[PDB]
Every structure is written in structure tokens, then in C-alpha cells.
Amino acid sequence: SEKYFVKNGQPHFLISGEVHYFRINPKLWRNHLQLLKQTGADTVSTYIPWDWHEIEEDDFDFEGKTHPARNLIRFIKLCKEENLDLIVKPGPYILAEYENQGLPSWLLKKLSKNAFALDENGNVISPDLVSYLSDEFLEYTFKWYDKVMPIISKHQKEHYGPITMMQLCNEIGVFQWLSGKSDYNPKVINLYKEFIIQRYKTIEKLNSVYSTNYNSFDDLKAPSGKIKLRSDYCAYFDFHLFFREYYNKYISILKNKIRSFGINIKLTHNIPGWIYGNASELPMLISTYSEIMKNHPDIIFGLDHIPEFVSFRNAHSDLACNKILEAMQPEAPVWAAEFQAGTREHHVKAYAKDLETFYIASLAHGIKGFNYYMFSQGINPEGKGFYGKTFYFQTALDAASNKLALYDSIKKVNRFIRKEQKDLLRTNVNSEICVGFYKPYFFTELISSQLLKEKKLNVEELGLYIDPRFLREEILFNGLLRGLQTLNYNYDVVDLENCDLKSLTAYKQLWITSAEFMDAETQNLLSEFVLNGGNLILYPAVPTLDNYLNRCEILKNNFGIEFITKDSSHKVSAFGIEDVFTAFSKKQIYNDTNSKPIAFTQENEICGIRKKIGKGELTILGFAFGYTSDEHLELIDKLVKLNKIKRELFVSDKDIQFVVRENNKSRYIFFLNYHNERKTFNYRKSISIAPFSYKVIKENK
Amino acid sequence: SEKYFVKNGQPHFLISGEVHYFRINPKLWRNHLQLLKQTGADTVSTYIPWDWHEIEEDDFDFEGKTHPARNLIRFIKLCKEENLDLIVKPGPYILAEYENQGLPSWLLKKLSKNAFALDENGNVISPDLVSYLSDEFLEYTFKWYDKVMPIISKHQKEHYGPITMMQLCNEIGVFQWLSGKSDYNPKVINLYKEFIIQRYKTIEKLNSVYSTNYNSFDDLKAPSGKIKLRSDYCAYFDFHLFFREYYNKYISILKNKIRSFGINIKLTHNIPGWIYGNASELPMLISTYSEIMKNHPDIIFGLDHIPEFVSFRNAHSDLACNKILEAMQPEAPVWAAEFQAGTREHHVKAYAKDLETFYIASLAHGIKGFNYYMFSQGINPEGKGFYGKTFYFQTALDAASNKLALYDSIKKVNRFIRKEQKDLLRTNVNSEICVGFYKPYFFTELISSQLLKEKKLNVEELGLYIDPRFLREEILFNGLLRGLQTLNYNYDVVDLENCDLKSLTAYKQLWITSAEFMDAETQNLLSEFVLNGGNLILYPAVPTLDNYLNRCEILKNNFGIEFITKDSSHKVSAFGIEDVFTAFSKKQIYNDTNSKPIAFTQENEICGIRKKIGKGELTILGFAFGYTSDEHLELIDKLVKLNKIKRELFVSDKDIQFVVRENNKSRYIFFLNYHNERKTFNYRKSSKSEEISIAPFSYKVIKENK
Ligand SMILES: OC[C@H]1O[C@@H](O[C@@H]2[C@@H](O)[C@H](O)[C@@H](CO)O[C@@H]2O)[C@H](O)[C@@H](O)[C@@H]1O
Ligand SMILES: OC[C@H]1O[C@@H](O[C@@H]2[C@@H](O)[C@H](O)[C@@H](CO)O[C@H]2O)[C@H](O)[C@@H](O)[C@@H]1O
Ligand SMILES: [Ca+2]
Ligand SMILES: [Ca+2]
Ligand SMILES: [Ca+2]
């Protein structure tokens, strides 16, 4: 049932360390590789920077002819000699705080206007930001691939070489995210037009969905500016769908070019979204890869985890991210392509004692492999560093291969992993709770995000009150997921798109965090789920619209629900819990015919009900609660207990987090203390831990 | 020389604890007061909530006639019986996680639309957010004061009562700030018009400053929408000056009303600004009080500190805030009106082990008094909680008066303070570094802030490149102030407005973080400082404009500086430090006339020089650095060492923070470990080395006699 990497036909925990040969004294390459191997790491990972090896147009140096640290060939040879497998990442983009994000200075100087990503005004967003499908950019990218890919092909594991995986580019779309600015390059706008014609066929069909009044597709312009009209929302929603196709087109062109060199090893991509030590926006970024993941089962996505610290302040971020990657990529192991080791920024400390706990928490939270980023600090050669001379701090090794505090933490965690990996990789948690992942709520990187600082989406202007980013960030990520993890209830996440009814029926409860909009297919799926005997918890709204904000009341009508939206005090009572704070004045007030009222406004109007439908059960709450009070934990706890769902353990201290992982033979109990407090507690089936620390217990069943 | 509270003509450390009588079973009031007293606290502090005591319109209960916890009179009497002095805070606003911020439900339902803060379009911003100078709001506030102030007057210290201090309202502007929208109520509009007429006298004079073409004052309105022209910036700048006069009018009106009841006690106000455990926006909010602090010597401002954790991520916030309060209020002690105890919200933990370190660091960082907020947990009666039933968590006492973990941390800190207060209160740090506080860079709460919904200020639209908010957050607060604290260099902050040359000349260095604009008065002061023998460090720009973005080249001319602004790589070299990352592509390029070039762009153009001017020294850097790399700390250290300023101690671990406080008699060494690492290090005084071992997120205090 579990997905995991395999070596010598056994479950293998992928332990990789990032070591940038191009940033290290080549005399010490062997020393770095030996010290990495001595931690029990099996793999080393590196960029192969285009800028570093194509020193001038059509002048390539992979042999150190012009600088010893250009000797990629010798670095590959050293990986083989020190019996490390190799992950290679030749771009074209690498980011990696490298000048021009890894693009050659000569290329950027020489490219035309509209090789670059453009704002609505036709101006360059950034002198290092190309348009992915620029003919110029792909021409030069292909010429780079023409030189680096034969080297990679020769040394690939399919030729019994050390190279086991290759990453395509780096964090596709990360610059549309960081600037909020969409590419308006005329090439992209033309592709968007083709995308729309293909999707709707006639202007009458599009007009019918958008309520527009185009005489033809010729009158259709890429959406820009703030959303004032539902037609604007519609045009931006399809612009989001278009960018998912665009990115799939980009990664497909790179992959096809790569396969033409006979490279048959595993291809990878890496997911950004952590900032300031939380990952509440990472689900938006992973949503941008929805078309890649459905069209390329041979590309393994890994997470870029940057927790910065390890506390109750961010404990939920890594589990929610792991669970969502599992939802969107169920046929491949959950792993971290970049797994924080040291810190990218001197002023943001990364403590060994923090990261050691993060590493163990990551095993509790289902991680199956990782690449310590950065294992080895680097020194940027001759002004190639974006931000300073030094690349990372507080790593396992400094750029001269001196051991730092993190080295012993990584050695201890790696020794645990190697001792347990055969059993641990085949364990899962027992989730009786499923939480729905409705991807369209996440499709907002161009109109609403933590990094886009002028919001184009204001749902009040559209006659709506539930903003999908507020819903997915505060009610879902920091709310329900944080609350279940705090309460030590196992959950799984499931992608609701093309979702199999049979993959929902194994769970005792399905939780759906719903805005006022939800497509007919998902409304139908949830109707069928309850009618066939599923238990659905739904809030804060029964949806009444589809993704284009056109009437769709399938779930509402199938469940016999009637409501009026009414203003009341922020606080409600729910299951006898008084003073439950809710996010909105506006609440759904439900007709209670054939229903049990279980929630009430301050004026005793019914804002939640329970009902039987066919063989199933429905709980609807017409109000939005996150986790900002003890009442929120009580409410989540009462809801879970409606279907008699039990924690795996009774633990005397409710502030201790635990994860029970088991298979037929083995149990691991992970205890995690996310608090600045020495805690002593006891447990039993349904010990002292230092601050910010952990304890792992094994049971034979 | 130090400013501190006094009792019996001796230095006295103000130790208060917040205990909300209205959220505690009144049978347990005495037990809460006795346990607070037993920590060595001398004072107890509470809100008197309007909503709680005016139960219906013109129906008042201060005696527990309708609910026993309405017996304010009894709570006051118990404070006296238990030998605690009492701070009272009767609003009208209290916030305090209380429904409607403490205003009565009946009031908010009765008030007409013009009582409320309104947006650009005339819509109510929030149903609990009044316009401060609303006739209706101030009428109801006066009727609330008519009933609560006689009780406070009768129980003052001068009538042998326990009441020693009273807070006026609560964090003026905090509610506007958190809503993300500014007040365009018609009272604001009309008072603004009167302000502009009084300020400019004629439309010709306004037009000459703004470069506008208005025919009359009737064509001019309070600015709304984004800043597109310099004239819009000018309109908003005057709007910022107006809001400071507006907040002074509000507090003057409350204060005058209070004094009429024969209330002679110390009046206080409390400063907001911490959010998510840092305080980089607090200097903006304290800046909104500039006119209150210059007109009311008798109102003492205290800080509301909410660190949430104690680590390198936020180590610099409390020191910078304490230093900025001192700069704006130099004649009163630095103190915390709200000093985090427990957590206001269940999902944000407050660990006793963090807060104990915060309390010690606060002593290191010059705090002279505080009010533990919250000392006692409460339970909201009758659904009065804004957010839930329970008021605070992980406090010193639970609502029942059981001791929690934090109680022992507070007793330990207070014991040290009571043993040491007579010396410790009279100690200072030796600050050879002064940092300039230029308040107009902070005047952006209407146009640019972390909380404002609309970004109205885009300086590139005005032909500028140095954003005043970017400068004051990243170059000063998170940059220079953070770097100096991290490097263990003592600094003072001095307000440059009406600043005495004599109060700058005691320092070895004055550091000025400058934008492209600076008023004539400040340009002239810094010019005279250097000519008379001062050592000035100025970056990232020689200013060439005044506060209205009109030509002002006083400093540039007095310092004999020629420059051109040119684009280059973000990286510069400075004092032989390569690959110093800087915020902007645009840099000032100086010619080398009568100067030593000390910084170069990637094309080897001069972006920094060192010069002698009269008897003084000038170092100017034509580029912007905060603290985002090791090069930044190296550069700050090099600049400080230009005038041979030395740390008080050699410490073997650069990541240990220390403060040395001394007087005549005593030296205190504070060691602060803001890191999740057990650290074993040695130190010595910089004028045989002692070895110290310190836990994660911990502290050591050494006292020496002499
Ligand atoms: O910067 C570190 C490392 O991270 C990867 O990109 C980061 C991304 O994960 C993150 O969400 C954002 C915002 O915090 O910063 C970076 O984009 C990247 O693949 C690596 O090259 C970087 O070295
Ligand atoms: O919320 C806790 C207490 O804090 C004060 O107001 C804070 C303010 O200091 C802070 O900057 C903002 C954002 O974090 O939140 C406000 O609540 C109040 O004066 C107290 O009444 C309140 O209980
Ligand atoms: Ca799993
Ligand atoms: Ca019905
Ligand atoms: Ca001082």
C-alpha cells in the first residue's frame, strides 16, 4: 500500500545532501563527498548551472579547462569513487541565489524584448525573467541541453552510472508567484486565445458561460486589472486553467528534448511555497502543477520544506503539505527535493536542535526521502552570488568541509532511519477522517495571494462573502488541518477532481470546507457519497454556484436544504458549545424540516443542522470557524466524535503531539514536543521530552 | 540622570499585575490580590468597561446590584485592604478582547451613521469603530465619565484611596490601524479643511507648496485614492499632520473632562504595534502620538509588549521600541503598560521559559516598570468575550486563582528586581552611538503600512526610489538597530525635531538613515553637527528635497557633495568588504573631491566617501543595506570602528548578546541567549576570562560591587 524508494530490491530511505561543486574548492570535492557518505547519506544533489558551463555563446567547459570548479566530469567521477548516487539539476533555471537565476549573462544581454515576460503595458517584469515558451529562449535552452544532456545520458543509472534522478528547470512559475505579475508576452496571450477557442469552440458558448457579448473570439483580450464583474472572474479563472496548461507545455517540451538523448532515469520537479517558516500558500503553488501531475506519472514532484524554526507556531505546515502532495501524487513517495539544512539568510537562524526535531517530525508526517538543502555551504565564485559571497550558513559542512553542529544531528537521524527504514517505509497512519482538496479554490496566484500585494479578487464586488483564499488558508490550513493535528486525529487529504467514489467510502467522515461555488461534478460526487452511506461534514456554506459563478444547486437540492443568508453576531452556539467565534456576520439559516438543529445564532436562528440522506449522514454548519480559540478545538472534537472516531492513544498531556505509524508487524509511536517546556506524561493504547524535542517508541504488534 | 519611578524619595520599580475584576468570581477577588502581592507586585491594573457598568442606557451598576462582578466599589476597597495601588482604565475604548471593544451594545445600536468611522465612499468601516470626535460618541462618553469619574476621584491616593494612575481610552488609532482603512467621517473632512486654511492662509500659498492650480479652498478636499502626483503626496502629508492634531484634540477633550472631577492622579496612555511577535510597525503608531507628547508633559505613555516568543527572530523589537519611546518621551521612565503574561489567543502559546527571558532582557534593555498583562486569567461573563469564553491562557493565575507555571517565573524576576531596584534603576549603558529618529518618515499610516488594505504610496510614480517605510522597517529597525544589538554596540535614539545640538555632541557617532527628502531644519542641524566637530554616518542618500518634495539642497551644499544617481548591480564593495548586497539598483555616485572613496559599484564608480568638514567627520554611503547577510554585520562593525568605539566585554561566542549597566556603585552584566543552542563561552571586560554555560532561550545576570 505505501510508496517508497527501493534499493537492492528493499525499501530504501532516499538520504541526499545538496553539495554545489560550482561553489566549492575542487581540492575539497572528495572531502565533502566523504563527509556526506559518513553520515549514512546514499545520494548527493547539485545544480549544473547553464551560466557556469556555457562561459560564452557556444563555448562550453565541463572539464575545468577555464576554472577548476567547471570540472563537472571530475565531480561525477568523485561521486562514483565515493559510492554516492547523484541527482543533477541542469535547469535552464536553477534560482539557488545564483546571479540571473542560472541564465548566462551573455544570453540575457542578447535576447529580444519579447523573449522576456511582459506586464499588461508590454514592459519587461525583470531583466532575468524570460517567457518560458519564447522561441529564442527554447532555442538557446535546447543548445545548452545539446551539450549537458550527453554527459548526463552517459552517467545515468540506466547505463549503471551514478545519476538516478534529474530535475527539469526549477520551481516552474515561482516568479509569477513572487511578483504576482502574470506574463502578458504576446506569445503567451496568443496561446491563451488558442486555449479558449479549443475550450469553448464558439463565441456563443463562451458568451453563454461568461455572460459576455463578443461578436467573435477576435474581440477576446487576456484579463487584466481588478475583478469588478463576474465575467472578469470567469476570464481570470480560465486564465488560471491556461497557465496550468502552459506550464505542462513547458515541462513537456523539456522532457521530450531530454528523452531524445536516451535519458530514461526518473525526472523530478520541486514545489515552492514556504515563506517566514509557514507553508499556508504552498497549496496554491502545488495547484499550478495540476496539469503536469495528471499528464506525467514519470515526473516525481518533491517538496521544498523551509520551516526556519520548529514550534507550535508552524507544526502543522509540513504535515498539511505532505498530505496534499499525497492527494495530488498518490502513486509516488512523498519526499523533500529541498529539505532545510542550515539557512539561506544569515539573519534567519537555523538551529541544529530545531532541524533535528523537524527531521523526526517529517518521518512521523509520512516523508519517504529527502535532500538536505544545504548539506554543504558554498562560496559563490567571482560575483555569481545574487545576495553576497557566502551561500547558506549553519549547514552540516561549511564551504571548506569543516563539520558544524548540524553534522552530528544529521548523522544521528540518518542512523535511526537506516536502522528502521525496512519497516518504517511500509507503515501508514490509520485515517478514518478524509479532508477534500477542491483545487479551484487554490487557483488564484494571479488575483489573490500572500505575495501579490494589490488584490484583484474582492468577492464582495461579485455579490459573494466567502473568499476562497481566506477559506483555504484560515478555515482549512491553519484551521481544520491545524486543529486535527493538534487534537492528534489522523486525516488523509483526497483530490476531489475525477475522484473515485470507492476511495471516499473507506473513511468514517469526509470533511468539505466549501465556498458559495463548487462545480457540478464535485456537487454530484458529494451527493452520491452521502446517498450511498457516507458521513459528510460541510461548512461554512452549502454551495449554490459553479466555478463560473452560474447557478448550480445539485448538492443543495439532492440534500433537501433550504436557507436564507442573514447577518448576526460573529459568535454562535454549536453542539452546546457557547461563544464559538465565526469569521462572518453573514450565516446560512437552514429550514429544519426533517433535520436536527445543532447550531444557533445569538438570536437563536438555526445556522447548523444534521440530517439523514439515503444511507448517509449530513452535518452542515452555516458559519466559518478556524482554530483561534479553545472552543474551535472543542467543536472539531465534537464533530469527529459524531461518528465515534477515536485517537490511537490516551496521552496525559494534551499539548504532546503523537503519530502512530503501523503495518501488520511493526508500530512506531512518534511523540513530538513543539513547546518551550520540559513535559513529563504517560500514554496507553485507546516519559520526559525536552523543549522542542521528540521521542520515538517501537512496538511489535 | 536615569528616569525612574520614585516612592519615599527612593528609586521604585513599578511592578503591576493586570487582574480583570469583571472576569473573576468576586468571592475570589481577594485571593487574586493576595497572590499578586505575594509576588512582590505593588500595583494592580484593570479596565472599567463601559459596556459592563452602563447595563442599559442611563442604567448604571458599580455596586453588584445586577451582577456581583459589577461591584467595582468592592474591588477598589479590596485593593486598599490588600495594600496594592490601583491603575484604572475606564475607556471609553478598552479593546481587551471584550465584545465591541468595551462599548455598550445599546450605544452602537443607537448611534447614527455619522458617529462611525467611514471609508472613501461613506460606508461604515466596522460596527464597533466610532469616529473619535463624533458629537454623539463624545456625548455618550461624557455621560459614562459623569458616572465612573466621581468614583475614581473619591478613591484616589490623595483621598487615602488606592488609585494612583488612570489610562485615557486605549491605544488611540489601534482600531483604525487594524481595520486597514482610514477615517473619512464628515467631522474629519471638515476639521481637515479648517486645518489646511489655518496652515496655508491663502489658496495661492497652498498652490505654491503643492504645485496645484485651485481657485479656492472650496475646490480642495481631504485626499483619497492612490498618490499619482507630488501634489497628492503633499495633500497626504498635511493629512498625516492633521491626524496627529486630531488625536491630540481627542485626548485633550478626555483629559479636560477628567480634570473637572478633581482627579489629580498620573494620567497614562498605551502604545500599540506588536503583531505576530515583532514590533517593526510600532514606531509608525507611536509617531501618531507626536502632538500628544509635545502638548501633554503630564500624560505618560507606556509600551504594550507582545513578543509571543523570545528568539533572534524578534530579539531587537523590544530594545528598538524602548529606545524610540525614550526618544519621544525623554523626561519620563520607559515602562510597559501591557507586559505580556500568558497569551490572548489559544493557538499562540506563551511559554513561561520564553517570557522569563523576555522579562530579564527588558531589564537589560532599560525598562523601569511594567504591568504583567495578563497576571490573572479571566472568564468572560454573559457572552462578553470578543472571541470565546476564556480571557487569556498560560497566565500567572488561572481564573480560579490557582498558580500556573508563569507564577514562579514572575516571583523569581520580581525578587531580583526588589533586591536590586535601588542600584539597577540608577544604572545606564555607555552609548557612544546615537541613531536619528526622523519622524516624518513614519508619517505613512494613511498611505503605506503592513496593515493598510490599499497601498497608496508608490514612490517611483513621484520620480523617487527610496520608500520611507522600506527605509524605516528594513534599513533602520530590522537593519541598523538589529545589527547594532546583534554586535553588542550600545546605541541611543534621539528625536531630530527641535533637537538641541548639545544633546548630539556627547556621542562619538551620529547615524542617520536618510531618504531623498528631509526638512530644512534637520538638514541644517546635521550640517551644524558636523561643522562643530560631530562624526556623521549618512546612508543611503544625501537628501535633496523637503517633506513636500520641493528642492532643498542645504545638507548637500554645506557638505560640498556632488553626485549623480546611476543604475548598477545590487552588490557593492565597501571598506574592502566585497559582494555587499544593497536594496536598490540606483546608487548615489560621488566625486572624490577632498574625500577618501571607501565604497565602489561593480563598475568601480564611487558610491561612498569619507571627508573632514570643519572640525567634524562625514561618512556617506550612496546605497541601502539592512541586515540580510554577514557582509552587513561586517560593514556596521567597520563603520563603528572608524571612531574606535569598543564593546564593554570580549565574549568568545559572537551569538551571545550582553548589556552592561552601571553607576558609581554597581555593574550588572546581562547575558542573553536568543538561540536554540546550549552555549558555553568565556568573557572578560575589554579594559582570567570567566566561563559561563547558558541554556537555550535563557539568561544569566552577574552583579559586581564597583
Ligand atoms: O531559497 C532557498 C532555495 O529554495 C527554492 O526556492 C525558494 C522557495 O522554496 C520559497 O518558497 C521562496 C519564498 O520563501 O524562496 C525561494 O524561491 C529553490 O529551488 C532553491 O534554488 C533555493 O536555493
Ligand atoms: O490583544 C492583547 C491586548 O493588547 C492591546 O492591543 C493590541 C495591540 O497592542 C496590538 O498591536 C494589536 C495587534 O497585535 O492587537 C491589539 O489587540 C490592548 O490594549 C489590550 O486591550 C489587549 O487585551
Ligand atoms: Ca500516509
Ligand atoms: Ca427541505
Ligand atoms: Ca539607557
Residue numbers in the entry:
A (entry chain B): 6 to 691, 702 to 716
B (entry chain A): 6 to 692, 698 to 716
What does the paper say about this structure?
The overall conformational change on binding of ligands is small (rmsd, approximately 0.2 Å). Thus, the wild-type (WT)-Sop2 complex was used as a representative structure in Figure 3. The electron densities of Sop2 were clearly observed in both subunits of the WT-Sop2 complex. The fitted Sop2 molecules in subunits A and B are β- and α-anomers of Sop2, respectively. When the GlcN recognition residues in the TkGlmA-GlcN complex are aligned with the corresponding residues in the WT-Sop2 complex, the Glc moiety at the nonreducing end of Sop2 is well superimposed with the GlcN molecule, suggesting that Sop2 is bound at subsites −1 and +1. At subsite −1 in the WT-Sop2 complex, the distance between the carboxy group oxygen atom in the Glu343 side chain and the anomeric carbon atom (3.0 Å for both subunits) and the angle formed by the two atoms and the glycosidic bond oxygen atom in the Sop2 molecule (159° for subunit A and 165° for subunit B) are suitable for nucleophilic (in-line) attack on the anomeric center of the Glc moiety by Glu343. The carboxy group of the Glu176 side chain interacts with the scissile bond oxygen atom in the Sop2 molecule (2.6 Å between the two atoms) and is located where anti-protonation can occur. These results suggest that Glu343 and Glu176 are the nucleophile and acid/base, respectively. In the WT-Glc complex, Arg349 participates in substrate recognition to give a stable conformation, whereas Glu102 is still disordered or flips out as the ligand-free structure. Contrarily, in the WT-Sop2 complex, the Glu102 residue in each subunit clearly faces subsite −1 to form hydrogen bonds with the Glc moiety, suggesting that the side chain of Glu102 must interact with a Glc moiety at subsite −1 to face in the direction of subsite −1. In the complex of wild-type IALB_1185 with sophorose, the electron density of sophorose was clearly observed at subsites −1 and +1, whereas in the E343Q mutant–sophorose complex, the electron density of sophorose was clearly observed at subsites +1 and +2.
The IALB_1185 protein, which is encoded in the gene cluster for endo-β-1,2-glucanase homologs in the genome of Ignavibacterium album, is a glycoside hydrolase family (GH) 35 protein. Here, we showed using recombinant IALB_1185 that this protein has glycosyltransferase activity toward β-1,2-glucooligosaccharides, and that the kinetic parameters for β-1,2-glucooligosaccharides are not within the ranges for general GH enzymes. Kinetic analysis further revealed that the enzyme has wide aglycone specificity regardless of the anomer, and that the β-1,2-linked glucose dimer sophorose is an appropriate donor. We propose that IALB_1185 be redefined β-1,2-glucooligosaccharide:d-glucoside β-d-glucosyltransferase as a systematic name and β-1,2-glucosyltransferase as an accepted name.
